[PDB]
């Protein structure tokens, strides 16, 4: 049971996908790859649909100084927002996630872009 999607991400604006009426014991598989631009994929899953932009903005605003100023902050926020997520699992910067459905219910699949650095002269997430 495999489905395909294609979309476009603009300035870190995510896209939601709904998986209605899954049953207990079901295992979900996901893979997201870059087909154009500088996109770095990020995949997350959650029970109730809520915009992750507000919290990820706080992650972006703390670009001054911290212990593991980016990676630890992003991991903490992601572990709280999503029940499962994956940043880099495939070949390169592509994502690959496996998640088993705990109970009976409907869930949502979130696709978007992570916070990365693409410069060697200075650091700018």
């Amino acid at each position: 049971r495999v489905q395909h999607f294609t979309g476009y991400i603009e300035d870190g604006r995510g896209i939601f996908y709904s998986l209605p009426d899954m049953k207990q014991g079901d295992i979900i598989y996901a893979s997201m790859q870059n087909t154009g631009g500088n996109l770095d994929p990020l995949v997350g899953i959650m029970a109730e649909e809520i915009d992750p932009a507000v919290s990820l903005g706080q992650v972006l605003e703390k670009a001054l100084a911290s212990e593991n100023d980016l990676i630890s902050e992003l991991t903490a926020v992601a572990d709280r927002i999503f029940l499962g997520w994956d940043d880099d699992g495939g070949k390169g910067y592509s994502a690959s996630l496996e998640f088993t459905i705990p109970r009976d219910g409907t869930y949502h699949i979130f696709a978007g872009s992570t916070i990365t650095n693409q410069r060697l002269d200075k650091f700018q997430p």
Binding site: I71, Y93, N117, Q118, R119, L120
Partner: protein, 160 residues
């Protein structure tokens, strides 16, 4: 002299077609790498670097790391130069580690371990905290592979 380069190895068990050099893999495996059972030797390199007014950012590239290896680094200024920032990124810039300031705040250290099959690492040293023209600040950089005693090496740079 000896020779260097890449090679392809074909090993067979009771398959006399291997010696023809066209033996396609078959069956269940019978051999594995010997290095995966244990740990190798240490390699240490020390370099002197200077951050000029227009050269406040510097990057270096490291050789390929096998899975399971460890990486260590530390920076110590020659004199009264302020402590710069230290971080570790791959060849594409993805951050992997950040430098920690020790309680005797005169050096910054870093540590990392290898998970992927091949890892290429880049070490960033930058003192662009502001726009001050401090002048001729010079620091000592010590790096090592599978060398956790970098704090007190004692031996001269060994290995490679």
């Amino acid at each position: 002299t000896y020779t260097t380069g890449s090679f392809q190895l074909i090993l067979g068990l009771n398959a006399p077609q291997v010696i023809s050099g066209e033996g396609e893999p078959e069956g269940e495996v019978f051999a594995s790498l010997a290095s995966l059972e244990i740990k190798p030797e240490a390699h240490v390199q020390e370099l002197e670097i200077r951050l000029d007014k227009d050269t406040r950012y510097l990057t270096q590239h490291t050789r390929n790391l096998q899975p399971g290896d460890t990486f260590h680094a530390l920076v110590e200024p020659i004199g009264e130069a302020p402590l710069p920032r230290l971080r570790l990124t791959d060849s594409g810039g993805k951050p992997l580690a950040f430098g920690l300031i020790d309680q005797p705040g005169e050096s910054v250290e870093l540590n990392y371990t290898c998970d992927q099959d091949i890892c290429e690492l880049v070490v960033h040293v930058d003192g662009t905290d502001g726009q001050k023209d401090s002048g001729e600040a010079v620091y000592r950089l010590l790096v090592g592979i599978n060398a956790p005693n970098l704090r007190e090496s004692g031996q001269t740079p060994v290995g490679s």
